Amino acid sequence: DPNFFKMVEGFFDRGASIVEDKLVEDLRTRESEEQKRNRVRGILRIIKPCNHVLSLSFPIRRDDGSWEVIEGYRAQHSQHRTPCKGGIRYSTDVSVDEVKALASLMTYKCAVVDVPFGGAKAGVKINPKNYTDNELEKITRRFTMELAKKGFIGPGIDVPAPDMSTGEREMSWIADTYASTIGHYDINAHACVTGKPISQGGIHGRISATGRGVFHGIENFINEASYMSILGMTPGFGDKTFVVQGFGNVGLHSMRYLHRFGAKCIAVGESDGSIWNPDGIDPKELEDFKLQHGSILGFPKAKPYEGSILEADCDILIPAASEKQLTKSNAPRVKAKIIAEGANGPTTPEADKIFLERNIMVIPDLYLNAGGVTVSYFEWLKNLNHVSYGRLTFKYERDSNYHLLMSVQESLERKFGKHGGTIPIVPTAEFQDRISGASEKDIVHSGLAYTMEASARQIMRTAMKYNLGLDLRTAAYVNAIEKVFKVYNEAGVTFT
Amino acid sequence: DPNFFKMVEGFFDRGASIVEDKLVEDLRTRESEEQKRNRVRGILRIIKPCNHVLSLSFPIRRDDGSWEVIEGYRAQHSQHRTPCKGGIRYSTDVSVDEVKALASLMTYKCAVVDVPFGGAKAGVKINPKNYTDNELEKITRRFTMELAKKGFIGPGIDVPAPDMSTGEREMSWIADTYASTIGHYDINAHACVTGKPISQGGIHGRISATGRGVFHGIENFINEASYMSILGMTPGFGDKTFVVQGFGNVGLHSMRYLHRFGAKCIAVGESDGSIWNPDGIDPKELEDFKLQHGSILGFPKAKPYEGSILEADCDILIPAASEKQLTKSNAPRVKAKIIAEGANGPTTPEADKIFLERNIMVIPDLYLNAGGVTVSYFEWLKNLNHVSYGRLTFKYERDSNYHLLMSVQESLERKFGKHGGTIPIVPTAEFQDRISGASEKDIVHSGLAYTMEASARQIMRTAMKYNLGLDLRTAAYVNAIEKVFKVYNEAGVTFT
Amino acid sequence: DPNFFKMVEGFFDRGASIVEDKLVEDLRTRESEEQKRNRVRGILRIIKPCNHVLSLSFPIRRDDGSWEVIEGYRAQHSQHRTPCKGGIRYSTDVSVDEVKALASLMTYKCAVVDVPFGGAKAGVKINPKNYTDNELEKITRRFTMELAKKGFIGPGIDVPAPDMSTGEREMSWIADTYASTIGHYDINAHACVTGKPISQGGIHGRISATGRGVFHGIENFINEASYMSILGMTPGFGDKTFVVQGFGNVGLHSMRYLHRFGAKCIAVGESDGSIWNPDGIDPKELEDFKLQHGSILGFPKAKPYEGSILEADCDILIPAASEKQLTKSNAPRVKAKIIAEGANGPTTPEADKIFLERNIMVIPDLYLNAGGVTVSYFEWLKNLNHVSYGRLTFKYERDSNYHLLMSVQESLERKFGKHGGTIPIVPTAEFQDRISGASEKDIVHSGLAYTMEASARQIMRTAMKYNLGLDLRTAAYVNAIEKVFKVYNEAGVTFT
């Protein structure tokens, strides 16, 4: 097993070269001046290497009066897009190469689902468990301050986010610290970080974003003929059955949505044991079980399955937890036809190769979990807009729908002397629900589905463009690399 | 042979501990609340770690039309004193740890010569020899731009300076770029870096600052009875004889001032051979000979000495070049009773131990070549004063001195009916020169002398305080550590 | 007994109306257009009212996890002079009027000793006793924070200072909170408040400032014939014999300097009992007694005196404590011929009336204790200068004195063939101390003594101009009022 640094770096280099040739010729080598068009590919070079990375060793006074110095890092891969966007990890295994790499991932991820950010990331070598809440506040703020002062947090410069180890609490604190300090004069200060609590300027529909994103990703591909054929899919008896490894935020919701739409959740597996049932697990139930107490283990209506679930027989397996789970080791023993990476780096570059060979379609992480980036973009926006989505349109929209209906009625009632006969004005019970429920998430969710969709088709058009099979992952990186490159190309360097 | 990182770390630790006991008790333990006065030592752990360190990767378009991405670093050790001060090195062997250490050194050096700057330092992994002039201007500016956006350059934030691999040229460029770009609105923009040409806001008496510093350092200790006894010095036949290793800027001047005052420069080395002559080597002559062609090799009035000039029989030995020359491998074989570190880290910790056993006094680097870092403070101040020193007072001063002399005169003449008899009015030829020379340097040099002098006495007072012998080095670092600690103590942390 | 508000308002009107007449005519009514010269005295009605007053209500989390909101106020009497200068008080009786009034007092006081500051002053209703150090820090930084967001602390805006209830701690915190927060990007951020610790950017000579100031005040009038006649002073048997009420920081040094220069301290009283000894009390000895333990009660070499020392028979009586001690009640029973207000408001307007009738000279608080304010200017200056006074000239200066002396010598030794005969070169012992001891406080004290002096004259010249007697108080206020007026007058309003 290799590490994300080499992996991602591979990913970039594989794509990078595939793009070169083409990127030269037909797309811009129409004006081949000095045939040094190859030389201008220096852009790529520039791109690849995380641009800035900042290490810091700041202090805090631990509740017991003592003094500890905490280290941390925040890298910023690219600023080809003004605000850098990236999460903040709190784990004692964080390492400048970790961040440097993920921050790289970030920029290419954003590009895929056309979000205007540069990729960045941070880690605070710390184990959240070994510190009292108060101490954690202390740390996040002081971290924020340092980050501000040196240009690593700012609405228009770099906007952090959470990451498993960190949640809306950290994030609110960040926001607050900035806003009351370095950013006291910024009308958009609270747009310095995303993932905030709704009461703090957070966007609704955040939680379920990552997961719903995974849903749609699978959806746009599982509804596509061409692909489903090559696997033999969009089947009658096979239809839809999926196994989801990891019942965390993203797995859970990812099961929710896959269910609601006619899919059977065969098996779910945690850090402990696993669950199985060919009839199907019900999200709500399993969710309320997991919550009510500890884990899924012993779930009533589910026989404890053993043997990595990764080798369960189903159509879609979604790795939603630990890194590199599918390796060259069990890669030739997976049953599922579709692998949907709902986590980051759940499959090794060698496993990718096995899968390719044995026609298994892998929906890349780069894409599949870009839903939470996407919705952050939205939170960001909502914080500039200084208003919650829908606020100034919902009711106007309602009014306008009724008139539309009223016009169909009145009109139809001109083809039969009446005045109450034909009633179209009545919206479908579904429509009526939507009308009376109109709230931010609706618009977010909708936005999310619009990007995931567009992007999927973009990937797909690129896989063809560069003749890759079910090699979505590399079509994806190529996609992002063509993007980032253009922006550079259509400018220069400092002669940009 | 260690490495500055461990070495300087050592130093810090050695002295830190020495300070801990004393620092706690009689200096502030008067009020020992909770006896947790040993816990509030945390301050020392905050101090040791170089606070911020930024790595970059920026591109430049080489003259041939190709694209290259350069890496570089800049670390700021402390900000306990607003403007961090530090050089910029251009060498292929630069490395995060290097800068993280030299920075560290800086802070402590400054705090010795009471210079209100935190320490910092940078490196741009490059070989100034594989680039054209034009390509070096491009690298130095971009480098400045990026440092500026992130908080590494700034009159009141961080103010860089040169380092062998870089000179005024690079500095002027830095200054300019800053003042034209990020620092356009800053009335002190040009103060963003020191070591600039005179025409670009430099100070006079910079070139001879380091050397003249070494000199006075040696001077304040050589004229101190106490010390020159425990060495059996301030002798009649021994008087003053020295050997200097390295004829670069700092060595040369060092020889020039040591001479002019009544010393005999027996030997002079270089990266090639060496020189010898028990009758003395003339500084002006050797200077011209080292300038008028290659190196000092074959100097006429010198016999090519051979056998590490470090051994050489002489009173004072001034390492002015390579790092860690005097190691635990020739340390027992030295002949000079005084080691005068006119270069950074010329002697290894182990060698420090040997010298300390065989009563050899070593004048620290942290102190003996803090001259530049003194005159740089001056440059900066000159850049804030928006005037040259003296400008407004010289002539006023002259006027006043002739009134003083004139009053003595007139006054005496009233003790003998005369009108042209006694003539004090006439200033001494020396005074007259000073009076018709009066320039900035005259003020800088004096300032240098005042600092070196007061600092020496400070070092001394500390050695005594902590009963160290001719162990200046750790007296120094203590001195520093005390200083730094005090600023921190009289505030807190973020409860500072 | 009245209240500063009314008192300091009475002072301003009384003088205001004297300024009017004159201020109109001669001085400017040379070009009396529309004889509306009277109407342009609106300036004086603009002047009199404290321009801005800010009331706060902020919270802190007491150690015991609870929450308490604190209420404070900062008033800015005038901004005719960019930085408003003024202390911060921590006392549960602090009111809006109390600050509005004292801020007033500031501006006029600063005028008197020609300090370019607008008056200011703030209070935080609080008892520094019912709060832990940690709680105090939290209150002074939040407080600052607030002040800084609303324009009440800034190096070019408003610069606070201590006040009995507070000290260098509070300040240093303020400094620091401000420099690490709202003032992060300000090269002068540490200039936002004076009274800091020397390790924090304080100035040397601060502690003794106020007292020295008193001393010089008393001096400049004692040495003036005209005045000392009207009292029958500058005696032979009387000579100099004073009684100081209060042995705090001011009262103590007052006694120190009044003694070093010939006076006899006959009595010293505190908040307990009082001392007495016709022969005299020695400052160092009473200052080591007070310190070594509790008070000065039972000082050997001192009989306990009883019966308000205000009525003691001596020449100079300096009230350096409690407000309004000398009232119309004891006023008639005072024996001193000179009342030197070392404190603020030690004498009530009706007492001033008695003293005036019985020909007792009272040196006003607006002037006598303007020493601290003076030095603070200097500290603020020091901070802009970014250097300690004397740092670049002391040695230059030394080196010059010597050529001066070596020029008298050489020259005299031309009037008798000799080379070592005459020996001027040798400074006096006193000169030699000074030479060795050259430090900031030297320069500062000298500045203080230049200002206190000028100003004394200035006041004098005005008490003559406006024909007052030994009514220095009013002469002073008038002197301030004439000043502030000018600065407004030489511009306008917004048509300024």
CSV table of N, CA, C and O in Angstrom, one decimal, chain A residues 17-76:
chain,number,residue,atom,x,y,z
A,17,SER,N,0.2,14.0,-18.4
A,17,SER,CA,0.8,13.7,-19.6
A,17,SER,C,-0.3,13.5,-20.7
A,17,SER,O,-0.2,13.9,-21.9
A,18,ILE,N,-1.4,12.8,-20.4
A,18,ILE,CA,-2.5,12.6,-21.3
A,18,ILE,C,-3.1,13.9,-21.8
A,18,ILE,O,-3.5,13.9,-23.0
A,19,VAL,N,-3.1,14.9,-21.0
A,19,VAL,CA,-3.5,16.2,-21.3
A,19,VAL,C,-2.5,16.9,-22.3
A,19,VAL,O,-2.8,17.5,-23.3
A,20,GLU,N,-1.2,16.8,-21.9
A,20,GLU,CA,-0.2,17.5,-22.7
A,20,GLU,C,-0.5,17.3,-24.2
A,20,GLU,O,-1.2,18.2,-24.7
A,21,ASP,N,0.0,16.2,-24.8
A,21,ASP,CA,-0.3,16.0,-26.2
A,21,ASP,C,-1.5,16.7,-26.8
A,21,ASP,O,-1.3,17.6,-27.6
A,22,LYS,N,-2.7,16.4,-26.3
A,22,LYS,CA,-3.9,17.0,-26.8
A,22,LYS,C,-3.9,18.5,-26.6
A,22,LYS,O,-4.0,19.3,-27.5
A,23,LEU,N,-3.7,18.9,-25.3
A,23,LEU,CA,-3.6,20.3,-24.9
A,23,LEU,C,-2.8,21.1,-25.7
A,23,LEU,O,-3.0,22.4,-25.8
A,24,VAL,N,-1.7,20.5,-26.3
A,24,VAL,CA,-0.8,21.2,-27.2
A,24,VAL,C,-1.6,21.4,-28.4
A,24,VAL,O,-2.3,22.4,-28.6
A,25,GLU,N,-1.5,20.4,-29.3
A,25,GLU,CA,-2.2,20.4,-30.6
A,25,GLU,C,-3.5,21.1,-30.8
A,25,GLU,O,-3.5,22.4,-30.7
A,26,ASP,N,-4.5,20.4,-31.3
A,26,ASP,CA,-5.8,20.9,-31.6
A,26,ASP,C,-6.5,22.0,-30.8
A,26,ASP,O,-7.2,22.8,-31.3
A,27,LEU,N,-6.3,22.0,-29.4
A,27,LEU,CA,-6.9,23.0,-28.6
A,27,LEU,C,-6.3,24.4,-28.6
A,27,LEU,O,-6.9,25.4,-28.3
A,28,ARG,N,-5.0,24.5,-28.9
A,28,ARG,CA,-4.3,25.8,-28.9
A,28,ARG,C,-3.2,25.9,-29.9
A,28,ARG,O,-2.8,27.0,-30.3
A,29,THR,N,-2.7,24.7,-30.4
A,29,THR,CA,-1.6,24.6,-31.3
A,29,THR,C,-2.3,24.7,-32.7
A,29,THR,O,-2.2,23.8,-33.6
A,30,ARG,N,-2.9,25.8,-32.9
A,30,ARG,CA,-3.6,26.2,-34.1
A,30,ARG,C,-2.7,27.4,-34.6
A,30,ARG,O,-2.5,27.7,-35.8
A,31,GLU,N,-2.0,28.0,-33.6
A,31,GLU,CA,-1.1,29.1,-33.7
A,31,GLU,C,0.4,28.8,-33.4
A,31,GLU,O,1.2,29.7,-33.2
A,32,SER,N,0.7,27.5,-33.3
A,32,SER,CA,2.0,26.9,-33.0
A,32,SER,C,3.2,27.9,-33.4
A,32,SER,O,3.7,27.8,-34.5
A,33,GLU,N,3.5,28.8,-32.5
A,33,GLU,CA,4.6,29.7,-32.7
A,33,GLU,C,5.9,29.1,-32.1
A,33,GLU,O,5.9,28.8,-30.9
A,34,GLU,N,6.9,28.9,-32.9
A,34,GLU,CA,8.1,28.3,-32.5
A,34,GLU,C,8.0,26.8,-32.0
A,34,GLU,O,9.0,26.2,-31.6
A,35,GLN,N,6.8,26.3,-32.2
A,35,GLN,CA,6.5,24.9,-31.7
A,35,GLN,C,7.1,24.7,-30.3
A,35,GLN,O,7.5,23.6,-29.9
A,36,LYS,N,7.1,25.8,-29.6
A,36,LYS,CA,7.6,25.9,-28.2
A,36,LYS,C,6.3,25.8,-27.4
A,36,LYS,O,6.3,26.0,-26.2
A,37,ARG,N,5.2,25.4,-28.1
A,37,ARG,CA,3.9,25.1,-27.5
A,37,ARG,C,4.1,24.0,-26.4
A,37,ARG,O,3.3,24.0,-25.5
A,38,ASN,N,5.1,23.2,-26.6
A,38,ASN,CA,5.4,22.1,-25.7
A,38,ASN,C,6.0,22.8,-24.5
A,38,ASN,O,5.6,22.5,-23.3
A,39,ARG,N,6.8,23.7,-24.7
A,39,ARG,CA,7.5,24.5,-23.6
A,39,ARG,C,6.5,25.2,-22.7
A,39,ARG,O,6.7,25.2,-21.5
A,40,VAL,N,5.5,25.8,-23.3
A,40,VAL,CA,4.5,26.5,-22.4
A,40,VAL,C,3.7,25.5,-21.5
A,40,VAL,O,3.0,26.0,-20.6
A,41,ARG,N,3.9,24.2,-21.7
A,41,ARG,CA,3.3,23.2,-20.8
A,41,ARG,C,3.9,23.4,-19.4
A,41,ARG,O,3.6,22.5,-18.5
A,42,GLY,N,4.8,24.3,-19.2
A,42,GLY,CA,5.5,24.6,-18.0
A,42,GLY,C,4.4,24.9,-16.9
A,42,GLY,O,4.6,24.8,-15.7
A,43,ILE,N,3.2,25.2,-17.5
A,43,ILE,CA,2.1,25.6,-16.6
A,43,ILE,C,1.9,24.4,-15.7
A,43,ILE,O,1.9,24.6,-14.4
A,44,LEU,N,1.7,23.3,-16.2
A,44,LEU,CA,1.5,22.0,-15.5
A,44,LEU,C,2.5,22.0,-14.3
A,44,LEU,O,2.0,21.9,-13.2
A,45,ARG,N,3.7,22.1,-14.6
A,45,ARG,CA,4.8,22.1,-13.6
A,45,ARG,C,4.3,22.9,-12.5
A,45,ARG,O,4.1,22.4,-11.4
A,46,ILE,N,4.2,24.2,-12.7
A,46,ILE,CA,3.7,25.2,-11.8
A,46,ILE,C,2.5,24.7,-10.9
A,46,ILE,O,2.5,24.9,-9.7
A,47,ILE,N,1.6,24.1,-11.6
A,47,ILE,CA,0.3,23.6,-11.0
A,47,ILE,C,0.5,22.6,-10.0
A,47,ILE,O,0.1,22.7,-8.8
A,48,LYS,N,1.1,21.5,-10.4
A,48,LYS,CA,1.4,20.3,-9.6
A,48,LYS,C,1.8,20.5,-8.1
A,48,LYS,O,1.1,19.9,-7.2
A,49,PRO,N,2.8,21.3,-7.8
A,49,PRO,CA,3.4,21.6,-6.5
A,49,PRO,C,2.6,22.6,-5.6
A,49,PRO,O,2.5,23.7,-5.9
A,50,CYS,N,2.1,22.0,-4.5
A,50,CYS,CA,1.4,22.8,-3.6
A,50,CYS,C,2.2,24.1,-3.5
A,50,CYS,O,3.4,24.0,-3.4
A,51,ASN,N,1.6,25.3,-3.7
A,51,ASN,CA,2.3,26.6,-3.7
A,51,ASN,C,2.8,27.1,-2.4
A,51,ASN,O,4.0,27.5,-2.3
A,52,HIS,N,2.0,27.2,-1.4
A,52,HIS,CA,2.4,27.7,-0.1
A,52,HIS,C,2.0,26.7,1.0
A,52,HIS,O,1.0,26.0,0.9
A,53,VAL,N,2.8,26.6,2.1
A,53,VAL,CA,2.5,25.7,3.2
A,53,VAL,C,3.1,26.4,4.4
A,53,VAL,O,4.2,26.9,4.3
A,54,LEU,N,2.3,26.5,5.4
A,54,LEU,CA,2.7,27.2,6.6
A,54,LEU,C,2.6,26.4,7.8
A,54,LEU,O,1.5,25.9,8.1
A,55,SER,N,3.7,26.3,8.5
A,55,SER,CA,3.9,25.5,9.7
A,55,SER,C,3.8,26.4,10.9
A,55,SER,O,4.5,27.4,10.9
A,56,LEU,N,3.1,26.0,12.0
A,56,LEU,CA,3.2,26.8,13.2
A,56,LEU,C,3.2,26.2,14.5
A,56,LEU,O,2.4,25.2,14.8
A,57,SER,N,4.0,26.7,15.4
A,57,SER,CA,4.1,26.2,16.8
A,57,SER,C,3.7,27.2,17.8
A,57,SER,O,4.5,27.7,18.6
A,58,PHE,N,2.4,27.3,18.0
A,58,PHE,CA,1.8,28.2,19.0
A,58,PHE,C,1.4,27.6,20.3
A,58,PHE,O,1.2,26.4,20.3
A,59,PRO,N,1.3,28.4,21.3
A,59,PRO,CA,0.9,28.0,22.7
A,59,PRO,C,-0.5,28.1,23.1
A,59,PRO,O,-1.3,28.7,22.4
A,60,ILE,N,-0.8,27.4,24.2
A,60,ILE,CA,-2.1,27.5,24.9
A,60,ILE,C,-1.9,27.2,26.4
A,60,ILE,O,-0.9,26.5,26.7
A,61,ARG,N,-2.7,27.7,27.2
A,61,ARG,CA,-2.6,27.4,28.6
A,61,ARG,C,-3.7,26.3,28.9
A,61,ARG,O,-4.9,26.6,28.8
A,62,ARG,N,-3.2,25.1,29.2
A,62,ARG,CA,-4.1,24.0,29.5
A,62,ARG,C,-4.8,24.3,30.8
A,62,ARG,O,-4.2,24.9,31.7
A,63,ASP,N,-6.0,23.9,30.9
A,63,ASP,CA,-6.8,24.1,32.1
A,63,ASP,C,-6.2,24.0,33.5
A,63,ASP,O,-6.6,24.6,34.5
A,64,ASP,N,-5.1,23.2,33.5
A,64,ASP,CA,-4.4,22.9,34.8
A,64,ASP,C,-3.3,24.0,35.0
A,64,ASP,O,-2.4,23.8,35.8
A,65,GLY,N,-3.4,25.1,34.3
A,65,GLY,CA,-2.4,26.1,34.4
A,65,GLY,C,-1.1,26.0,33.7
A,65,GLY,O,-0.4,27.0,33.5
A,66,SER,N,-0.8,24.8,33.2
A,66,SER,CA,0.4,24.6,32.5
A,66,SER,C,0.5,25.2,31.1
A,66,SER,O,-0.5,25.7,30.6
A,67,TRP,N,1.6,25.0,30.5
A,67,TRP,CA,1.8,25.6,29.1
A,67,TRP,C,2.3,24.5,28.1
A,67,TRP,O,3.4,23.9,28.3
A,68,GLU,N,1.6,24.4,27.0
A,68,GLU,CA,1.9,23.5,25.9
A,68,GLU,C,2.0,24.2,24.6
A,68,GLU,O,1.3,25.3,24.4
A,69,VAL,N,2.9,23.8,23.7
A,69,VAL,CA,3.0,24.5,22.4
A,69,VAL,C,2.5,23.5,21.4
A,69,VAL,O,2.9,22.3,21.5
A,70,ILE,N,1.5,23.9,20.6
A,70,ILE,CA,0.9,23.0,19.6
A,70,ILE,C,1.4,23.4,18.2
A,70,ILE,O,1.4,24.5,17.8
A,71,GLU,N,1.7,22.3,17.4
A,71,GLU,CA,2.1,22.6,16.0
A,71,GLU,C,0.9,22.3,15.1
A,71,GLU,O,-0.1,21.7,15.4
A,72,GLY,N,1.0,22.9,13.9
A,72,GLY,CA,-0.1,22.8,13.0
A,72,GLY,C,0.4,23.2,11.6
A,72,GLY,O,1.5,23.8,11.6
A,73,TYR,N,-0.3,22.9,10.6
A,73,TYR,CA,0.1,23.3,9.3
A,73,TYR,C,-1.2,23.6,8.4
A,73,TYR,O,-2.2,23.0,8.7
A,74,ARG,N,-1.0,24.4,7.4
A,74,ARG,CA,-2.1,24.7,6.5
A,74,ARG,C,-1.4,24.9,5.2
A,74,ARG,O,-0.5,25.8,5.1
A,75,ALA,N,-1.8,24.2,4.2
A,75,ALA,CA,-1.2,24.4,2.9
A,75,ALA,C,-2.2,25.0,1.9
A,75,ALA,O,-3.4,24.8,2.1
A,76,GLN,N,-1.7,25.6,0.8
A,76,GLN,CA,-2.6,26.2,-0.1
A,76,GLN,C,-2.0,25.8,-1.4
A,76,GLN,O,-1.0,26.3,-1.8
